[PDB]
Swiss-Prot record, chain A:
Summary of the function given for this chain in its UniProt record: Prevents the cell division inhibition by proteins MinC and MinD at internal division sites while permitting inhibition at polar sites. This ensures cell division at the proper site by restricting the formation of a division septum at the midpoint of the long axis of the cell.
Zinc-finger in keyword set: no
Designated name of the protein: Cell division topological specificity factor
Lineage: Bacteria, Pseudomonadati, Campylobacterota, Epsilonproteobacteria, Campylobacterales
One GO BP: regulation of division septum assembly
Length: 55, 56
């Protein structure tokens, strides 16, 4: 009933981004207001994984 | 040394979104503020948009 988008943020388990999850955040703000997706799943794999589903 | 961070924006070939640019532009832009890197690389290969960033 609908197509889907996926943003995967990848990096090394080595780094310490004292601002990672915020980047993990603001970035989303950029996809929802442009894709208008109500449905979103973020989970970790280090590799954050955000799957969007559109309207 | 050599700290690689990379974003992948997966999409369908079908699905239009005549703007995988700005979507990108904004994601990139953000990224360029939080990591402040000046070494940015984006290749493009069920469409899959990758982007390597090596922070300073």
């Amino acid at each position: 009933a609908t197509d889907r988008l996926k943003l995967i943020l990848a990096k090394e388990r080595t780094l310490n981004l004292p601002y990672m999850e915020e980047m993990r955040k603001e970035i989303i703000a950029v996809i929802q207001k442009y894709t208008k997706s109500s449905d979103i799943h973020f989970k970790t794999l280090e590799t954050i994984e955000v799957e969007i589903i559109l309207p």
